[PDB]
Design a protein around this ligand. Structure first.
Ligand code: FMN
Ligand code: FMN
Ligand code: ROD
Ligand code: ROD
Lengths: 313, 313
């Protein structure tokens, strides 16, 4: 019994990888992720130009999860592109490169340059749709008309299979609408569910203060707080997008959590907050735990239970 | 040192009450909440006609919280109106009556008949804007033009101060819009943040099954899952609605959680999942734990720290 799988025409030793933004910003981080037992890795979402990001403290963690308003600190697209092109060892595992431009034009300019490296090396694009929008408007993935424009422009500019990172939704009509938009794009072959649960607020009772500095303490939530939300989105998309893959992300701390995501429909399982907290050693433990649950259940393959969550009557 | 508050022309011994839907369906429930040490009570959100609600299991609870898709089982408006006009003992504590009609007109007919009882007995209206829209559209409070319509018509029809129960939002543009809408209506004197976090999905690893029956296992989340989300919404609306009160609801299990809510801006503090799980004895413990925190910090009243959460710079 081993967890290897094949998707998007790549081979993966197991279904685990980091979540975009965790342990993937610098060359040192990417080498450390490559050296881990993860099945794959994804680089920090990038902009055309480097960014310092928001003032610190900008990330904090707690027993039940984490909050962040990092502000997209990153080395810039030229760095991640050079990483994909010249530095990454594709014999070790596949690489996803995440992009999140400030505008549709910025996104188009980066994907045009990425396309030739994706052909030459097999680096895979994850487009981060939790990106800023026009004035007055929510993030792009919560504005379905902007999301349709961005995906049209990117599909045309890029021309190759890619995936999208989605924020969580909380209403069934939204699931219906969001999946219908994504289903208009045959190049979108995977959907990752979910990004951080937006704009929560952690307050420390002793100091009577918020715990991160930007945005008056508001920031995205990850970890145990968000698992049932993450499983919902995974399963909603799995059901509505039968010709695409779904990657789960949200609240993975154990092989059991991972098991649940795969039952919900996940092909790959991303780890954010728990990886931030525990370090890359976590991938050996998650593999071991997930194999142990499978043995106890008599499952030999992931395919045997992926997406087979049971409903009641 | 005291928990007393005076608001909306009523006097409350302390800020605690049940969350709508918990321990408030039946005359027996309402008499039990009345008997409790809560500073107030609210009745189950009602429709004109009684409802059986969804098939069971439709609520489950776990260490970090709860999921429900109850389908608004309730005894009908005539019953809650009779409880408010003839049965409730107002010398014990104040009463909120929650309504959630399936259309603007069903809300209008109910508030027209509540008005004289509100004037004569002092019952306070909480309008639950998480009611379904036309199916296939999101819930009313996630459709800002529908929410506006409902509030115009209910304001005209009722003509007395009332409050609104809001779902959580996750995007600053949403906070901005939702508050602007509410700020159009001077009779909306209190905003309760938040209802359950919509359409999560709990999966049981052993059985490989969702844990509630309706909606293929999708339901609203409460409890520890949702505290930072609830704090964010309380503070967002506190900061955007300076002429309105904010009541806090979500994730309260302790006097410390109540303290955080209050710091965020909460006036009243509602207790759902933890009350469902622990029973009405929770109110004495909450009061004792909140008083202990206040004593240790030197606070004598709630207004000394309400809304005084600190930001960093
Ligand atoms: C410090 C930090 C930085 C992140 N940066 C990104 C990013 O650059 N792009 C992105 O798509 N998601 C980003 N995320 C979101 C995660 O990729 C993931 O969607 C989220 O944390 C929920 O997964 P978790 O519960 O395992 O944390 C970030 C998360 C954290 C905690
Ligand atoms: C079984 C159940 C029934 C509920 N019914 C109602 C309802 O009728 N009206 C309403 O406004 N909120 C309803 N809610 C939401 C709660 O009032 C509350 O907003 C939510 O559970 C979050 O608080 P908590 O974290 O303390 O549970 C219900 C919650 C539960 C768990
Ligand atoms: O860098 C982040 O703060 C971040 N944190 C998350 O939990 N998820 C994310 O997707 C991101 C980056 C979001 C983003 C994307 C594009 C431009 C700007 C930003 C922002 F960080 F500034 F918000
Ligand atoms: O009764 C519920 O299912 C319920 N659960 C919550 O956590 N919050 C709620 O507001 C509700 C009631 C929502 C509602 C409102 C009006 C008509 C119908 C309903 C619905 F339950 F059928 F969705």
């Amino acid at each position: 019994m081993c967890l290897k799988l094949n998707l998007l025409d790549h081979v993966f030793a197991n279904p685990f990888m980091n979540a975009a933004g965790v342990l993937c910003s610098t060359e040192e981080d990417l080498r450390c992720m490559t050296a881990s037992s993860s099945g794959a890795l994804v680089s920090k979402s990038c902009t055309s130009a480097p960014r310092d990001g928001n003032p610190e403290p900008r990330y904090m963690a707690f027993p039940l999860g984490s909050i962040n308003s990092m502000g997209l600190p990153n080395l810039g697209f030229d760095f991640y592109l050079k990483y994909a092109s010249d530095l990454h060892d594709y014999s070790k595992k596949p690489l996803f490169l995440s992009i999140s431009g400030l505008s549709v034009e910025e996104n188009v300019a980066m994907v045009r340059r990425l396309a030739p490296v994706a052909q030459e090396k097999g680096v895979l694009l994850e487009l981060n749709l939790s990106c800023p929008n026009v004035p007055g408007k929510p993030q792009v993935a919560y504005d379905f008309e902007a999301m349709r424009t961005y995906l049209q422009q990117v599909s045309l500019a890029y021309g190759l299979p890619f995936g999208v990172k989605m924020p969580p939704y909380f209403d069934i009509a939204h699931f219906d609408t969001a999946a219908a938009v994504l289903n208009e794009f045959p190049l979108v072959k995977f959907v990752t569910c979910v990004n951080s649960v937006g704009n929560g607020l952690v307050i420390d009772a002793e100091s009577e203060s918020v715990v991160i500095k930007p945005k008056q303490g508001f920031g995205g939530l990850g970890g145990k707080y968000i698992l049932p939300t993450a499983l919902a989105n995974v399963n909603a998309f799995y059901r509505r997008c039968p010709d695409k893959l779904v990657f789960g992300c949200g609240g993975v701390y154990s092989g059991e959590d991972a098991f649940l995501h795969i039952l919900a429909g996940a092909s790959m399982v991303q780890v954010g907050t728990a990886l931030q907290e525990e370090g890359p050693g976590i991938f050996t433990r998650l593999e071991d735990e997930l194999l142990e649950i499978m043995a106890r259940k008599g499952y030999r393959t992931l395919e045997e239970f992926r997406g087979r969550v049971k409903t009641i009557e």
